[PDB]
Design a protein around this ligand. Structure first.
Ligand SMILES: C[N+](C)(C)CCOP(=O)(O)O
Ligand SMILES: C[N+](C)(C)CCOP(=O)(O)O
Ligand SMILES: C[N+](C)(C)CCOP(=O)(O)O
Ligand SMILES: C[N+](C)(C)CCOP(=O)(O)O
Ligand code: NA
Ligand code: NA
Ligand code: NA
Length: 296
């Protein structure tokens, strides 16, 4: 995908009890059994998963990623074997069902292999099964190498990477126009409006590469709430807070809270001229898009 990348990473997997039936008497008893091989509470509208917990140095809680493939290696019965998963397999619920004939004086142990890719609980990645005598020894499976390959947005380097900021609900880009002889933010369909994100002691700064008044390039909130662009200063009014852990990445959905008006977030609002405002106790979702390449 245009702006994403694959990365290998270690994930946690374990063999659970699953189901256990004991037939201590005679004769052979039949039992129906149903299991659902699939990711727990999987969203049908998307494959992007918001991390509930970390996956090493690469993923942190709240980070967006997509599971490309998962490869867990196990040892049973005294022999090694490995099972791989496709993207379609990790995101599908297969309700496997059938009858198991338990022979007399024997236990049926259906083991349940799972995987927790940073919060994403893959219930029943695999089913081994094991019929064994009572009270005889049985082989317990053990995961030897659990690992996954995730898909993430290309990183945004602060003060370096040129991005486009797009309003998620309205699918329109933040653009710059003149208002009161100052540069001003307003929503538009143009892909020509590039920005650079910075970070210092006071917060994040949104610099425009499309100003008409030279030097007036950092986004800030007026007392009235309208978003204008000023010259670089120490003022909190031009400093912002992002609700997402670094590193920022392509396609990240974020909110921008003002550092001076601390409860006022950046959003769409029908102004008389422009429509990008800082409004109290409300904060709209914006997409960060890493720019492609211009032709020449
Ligand atoms: C994995 N399996 C249950 C389909 C075959 C292996 O049976 P067993 O290893 O418990 O004897
Ligand atoms: C007046 N307004 C609330 C619609 C936005 C204008 O902000 P401002 O340009 O007066 O600083
Ligand atoms: C937008 N509001 C009128 C609800 C309050 C926010 O004022 P402001 O923080 O944008 O200056
Ligand atoms: C006082 N100072 C000039 C060193 C910093 C002031 O930054 P500012 O918020 O007044 O623009
Ligand atoms: Na600094
Ligand atoms: Na300012
Ligand atoms: Na408007």
């Amino acid at each position: 995908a245009e702006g994403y990348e694959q990365i290998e990473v270690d994930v946690v997997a374990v063999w659970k009890e699953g189901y256990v039936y004991e037939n201590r008497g005679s004769t052979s008893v039949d039992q129906k059994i149903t299991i659902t091989k699939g990711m727990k509470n999987v969203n049908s509208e998307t494959r992007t998963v918001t991390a509930t917990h970390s996956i090493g140095s690469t993923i942190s809680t709240g980070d967006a990623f997509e599971i490309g493939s998962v490869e867990v290696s196990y040892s049973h019965s005294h022999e090694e074997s490995q099972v791989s998963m496709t993207e379609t397999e990790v995101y599908e619920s297969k309700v496997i069902e059938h009858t198991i004939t338990i022979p007399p004086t024997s236990k049926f142990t259906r083991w349940q292999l799972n995987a927790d890719v940073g919060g994403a609980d893959i219930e029943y990645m695999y089913l081994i099964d094991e019929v064994t005598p009572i009270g005889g020894t049985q082989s317990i499976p053990q995961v030897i190498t659990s690992r996954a390959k995730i898909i993430v947005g290309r990183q945004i380097i602060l003060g370096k990477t040129e991005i486009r900021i797009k309003h998620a609900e309205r699918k329109e880009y933040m653009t710059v126009v003149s208002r009161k002889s100052w540069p001003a933010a307003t929503l538009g369909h143009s892909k020509l409006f590039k920005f650079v994100l910075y970070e210092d002691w006071g917060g994040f700064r949104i610099k425009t590469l499309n100003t008409m008044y030279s030097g007036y390039e950092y986004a800030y909130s007026s007392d009235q709430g309208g978003i204008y662009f000023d010259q670089g200063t120490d003022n909190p009014k031009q400093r912002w807070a992002i609700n997402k852990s670094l590193p920022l990445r392509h396609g990240d959905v974020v909110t921008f809270m003002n550092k001076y008006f601390t409860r006022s977030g950046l959003c769409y609002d029908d102004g008389p001229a422009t429509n990008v405002y800082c409004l109290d106790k409300r904060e709209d979702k914006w997409i960060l898009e890493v720019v492609g390449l211009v032709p020449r």
